[PDB]
Assembly symmetry: C2
Homo-oligomer: 53 residues x 2
């Protein structure tokens, strides 16, 4: 409903790498990508808004 | 070749990624691929030691 389609141009070598990891983790490619990117994003934002020393 | 990846995401996910992409002055695409490729690299190397 509220959802969005985010469309990524990517190098075929990158798709291959991500697919291999998703297979190891037994995750959909989308789940692997979004979980990793959001995890990295929270870190970036907390680094700037809280762990700013 | 170059390829196309469609990701269905939550709007709160897109909003979060874009906020961090802006902070780093990086395109959303570059932020997402770079973090996911870095994580993937890490995943295959920890698997290789299991074998």
């Amino acid at each position: 409903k509220s959802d969005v389609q985010l469309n990524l141009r990517a190098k075929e070598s990158q798709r291959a790498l991500i697919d291999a990891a998703a297979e190891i983790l037994h995750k959909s490619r989308t789940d692997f990508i979004l979980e990793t990117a959001c995890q990295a994003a929270e870190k970036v934002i907390l680094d700037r808004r809280v762990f700013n020393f």
